[PDB]
Ligand binder design. Structure first.
Ligand SMILES: NCC[C@H](O)c1cccc(OCC2CCCCC2)c1
Ligand SMILES: NCC[C@H](O)c1cccc(OCC2CCCCC2)c1
Ligand SMILES: CCCCCCCCCCCCCCCC(=O)O
Ligand SMILES: CCCCCCCCCCCCCCCC(=O)O
Ligand SMILES: [Fe+2]
Ligand SMILES: [Fe+2]
Lengths: 510, 510
């Protein structure tokens, strides 16, 4: 949990417009940037929160900004450019908001505002949001290269900002299809050297709980042998979605509603046999944005999730007007919100009818349960890994390249305090022990893990976070480096301009 | 959690018959019994596990045995007598099992085998089970005084072994009524000096979820202003219950079944206005035996519970044949059992219709939620206070006289390890910090708290536990005294005879 209040309101700098740079700045280092750290931290976020006098209303509406911190020989640079999306270009052209963003209707056509994340396919990098348009970008110059419409290649209406990436370069993702949820597989770059998006395909299909209302889906789970998809009670109302939008005046946020009765339905597919498994896993209601990690232990899937306890859409609390309130008002607003909680679900693969009425989760080191009912539903209870009052462990990351889809011990995350990011956390998922890094009036981003080249252990490396530190006595922002073992500060690299909120990113080694 | 295995099988001495004494033994003390500790530890449990060659099958079938440890001027005695119940007396008379116990049918009339607990009414003490018969006993001589039939006074078919006791002597309890659940209030001893059981009355009534199937109920919650009752999916099947028993040949265990779909319904009544409150609090399925404590915080009830995750009846795992298995087999048997978990529920008293869809639990220091649905059900999620794999924090106790029904910080309990009691625990319910006391091949009982008489602090006292320590190098058993602050050992008082399992009790000051 946080041990800090924010009466000064410095967090408002997260949602304040900034200018791009025309070339890299030097970041002034204190401490020692590790000498083995060679590459680029690439991150996406909104950078422009109004077009002249027309404002963006929601956290996910600001125009995409691509950020880069470079590391070489203990020296650091910072660079950023706006992504030349249709939404951005046409807004600069017409000096107004032209494309409807997530929660901002444009007055007189799907947004490609790639503000959420960046990821590799083949030798290319794509910035993304959650729509059908992803944007190829140049990771060295931050120049915008091309828009790609995923509907040109595969049958999905959108895809998450959270594709899984196997070590050989294979990319998996999930998207709604107008009804089902499809898993797209993009293969690695082959000897022919043609673009792997051309070779995309749907490999498996998850069914929908309601024919005219699919669930919102933000991420999913992957293991060597299985795909896990969590169907929540936050639904997209297709009657409001497909009807004339600039007649009534609707945005994306206007089409969400909550199913009160369904709870959460969990779904598994066989990855290698490309087949849906018909096990009716069921639990109580929560919003889910981020899977932490998924793995196989004897005949059981371990599913670690950052949950929000309730069925109201957490995104209702992320309008900019609310996030820019004063600290007492921010806290008051979050009182009725769903409660964050890290939970471990355990999904049995072997269901024997003879065990009807009993707990199938026979593993020796969990309290998660799964109960086979007579109607063949499997009712799940979680093991809580972390719980603090309006203290979210969110934006989780692990040592992904060596432990994704595999037995693991450590997660890192951003700590939210009534939605305000004010700390960095590490969680031992076996023991439930936690570590915190926190300074007053300091607003960090998602921590990203980078392994030491000679690492023998899971947490032998550093985490990188972008921290916004307003209020004089400091420079406006800095790149923070923490030791992954205990979250003790290794270095920081200060820059002389403000940085807004960023969501997701990656480290690109070189 | 436990840090100990039990391959030697010493826990089998908990379920082995013993002889009563004709007068007190000295307990050999090591360490220093506190000089302010003056009174009697009184405890109940089964002492006779077969009548000749007819065996009792279930943990709750053995004939009631009343135990007493006396403390005066740093010196200790131990004494025990069988309770001369009908069941016991008639069994000694007829040299066979005459009355049907909980899970042992007698072959050719309700049991009064008072093996569970002992409690004060007026100037008297009553040993009890969960039936309509309670047994007045003499707390100094351990003589049986009389049988009391509660049906002679008030309209209930049984009452729990867990009445609440307000400081003025007022006694509340709950019982099934063949359909409703009635709260009985027995008033304190008055100036007229007549027996308070004659002044018993039903003050409030809780409804039933199913007309022909009432839930098993073991305990309930009480605050200055409210009564809380938790209706679980472990049901008593009245069609099997009332039909002729010694025709086919049924016991009590044969009449329990699990409702798969209802989950858990929670109920509040207004204590002082003697009125049921019509709030439909609902959650996922669990067995419940012990409430820890209940209290009021602003307009919310805090409900702390020792839960078992699942709907199968935990009592299915407590046949003596299973509990007497070898360690590897005991562990294997418990694998499919419900998982123990300490949970905090938070029940809002002010339900506004305007908050439909939202989390009503606006308190600042909990992660528990309560969600108002459109059908006016209030869906609850807990805050988990403690969770270990087949490690139950059970038989909870608090500093009851000063903190029962009130804001509190500390609970004590018996740690079960795949149902085997092998340690003593303290839980800070605000911070979730735990303390453990454990020695190899040592099988403790419920810890009972005793305040230093001049304590201002909640945990300024000691806990007392009866510990069975088989295997040579020690005497068969001992009374343990721990400091309540940190569970460090203060003294023990060894006795030269075995003691079987005991369930509940009290400290009687003098
Ligand atoms: N990061 C959360 C919001 C997301 O950036 C976003 C921004 C703008 C539009 C969106 O639409 C999601 C739908 C889902 C169904 C298919 C079409 C896209 C989603
Ligand atoms: N300690 C748990 C079991 C309890 O000792 C016990 C022992 C013997 C008979 C019982 O009967 C419970 C019924 C419930 C319905 C009303 C009558 C009593 C219950
Ligand atoms: C760095 C963000 C701080 C301000 C917003 C915090 C509220 C986040 C709620 C949980 C995560 C929701 C998903 C947002 C990230 C994403 O778009 O992928
Ligand atoms: C000292 C007891 C150890 C063996 C029994 C352990 C399983 C207990 C399950 C939860 C409590 C059930 C109620 C038993 C005490 C009672 O009858 O009130
Ligand atoms: Fe995300
Ligand atoms: Fe009990």
């Amino acid at each position: 949990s946080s041990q800090v209040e924010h009466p000064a309101g410095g967090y408002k700098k997260l949602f304040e417009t900034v200018e791009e740079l025309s070339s890299p700045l030097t970041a002034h280092v204190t401490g020692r940037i590790p000498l083995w750290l060679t590459g680029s931290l690439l991150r996406c976020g909104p950078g422009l929160f109004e077009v002249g006098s027309e404002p963006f209303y929601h956290l996910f509406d600001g125009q995409a900004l691509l950020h880069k911190f470079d590391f070489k020989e203990g020296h650091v640079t910072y660079h950023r450019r706006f992504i030349r999306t249709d939404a951005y270009v046409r807004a600069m052209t017409e000096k107004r908001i032209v494309i409807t963003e997530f929660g901002t209707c444009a007055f007189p056509e799907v947004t490609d505002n790639a503000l959420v994340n960046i990821y590799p396919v083949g030798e290319d990098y794509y910035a993304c949001t959650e729509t059908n348009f992803i944007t190829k970008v140049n990771p060295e110059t931050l120049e915008t290269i091309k828009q790609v419409d995923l509907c040109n290649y595969v049958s999905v209406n959108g895809a998450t900002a959270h594709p899984h990436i196997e070590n050989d370069g294979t990319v998996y993702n999930i998207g709604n299809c107008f009804i089902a949820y499809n898993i797209v597989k993009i293969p690695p770059l082959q000897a022919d050297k043609e673009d792997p998006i051309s070779k995309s395909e749907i490999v498996v299909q998850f069914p929908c709980s309601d024919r005219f209302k699919p669930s919102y889906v933000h991420s999913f789970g992957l293991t060597p042998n299985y795909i896990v998809f969590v169907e929540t009670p936050v639904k997209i109302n297709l009657f409001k979605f497909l009807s004339s939008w600039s007649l009534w005046g609707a945005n994306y946020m206007d089409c969400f509603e909550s199913n009160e009765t369904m709870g959460v339905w969990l779904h598994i597919a066989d990855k290698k046999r490309k087949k849906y498994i018909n096990n009716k896993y069921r639990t109580s209601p929560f919003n889910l944005f981020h899977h932490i990690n998924t793995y196989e232990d004897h005949e059981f899937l371990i599913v670690d999730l950052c949950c929000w306890k309730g069925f109201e859409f957490v995104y209702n609390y992320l309008y900019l007007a609310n996030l820019r309130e004063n600290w007492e008002e921010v806290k008051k607003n979050a009182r009725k919100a769903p409660q964050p909680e890290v939970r471990r679900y355990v999904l049995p693969l072997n269901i024997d009818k003879a065990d009807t009425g009993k707990n199938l989760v026979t593993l020796p080191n969990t309290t998660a349960t799964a109960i086979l009912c007579s109607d063949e539903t499997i009712w799940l209870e979680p093991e809580v890994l972390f719980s603090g009052p309006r203290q979210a462990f969110e934006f989780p990351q692990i040592n992904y390249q060596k432990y994704g889809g595999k037995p693991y011990t450590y997660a890192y995350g951003l700590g939210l305090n009534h939605f305000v990011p004010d700390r960095l956390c590490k969680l031992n998922v076996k023991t439930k022990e936690t570590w915190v890094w926190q300074e007053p009036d300091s607003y960090p981003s998602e921590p990203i893990f980078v392994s030491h080249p000679d690492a023998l252990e899971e947490d032998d490396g550093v985490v990188l976070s972008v921290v916004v530190s307003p209020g004089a006595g400091q420079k406006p922002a800095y790149l923070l480096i923490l030791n992954a073992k205990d979250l003790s500060e290794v270095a920081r690299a200060e820059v002389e301009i403000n940085i807004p909120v960023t969501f997701h990113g990656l480290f690109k080694k070189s």
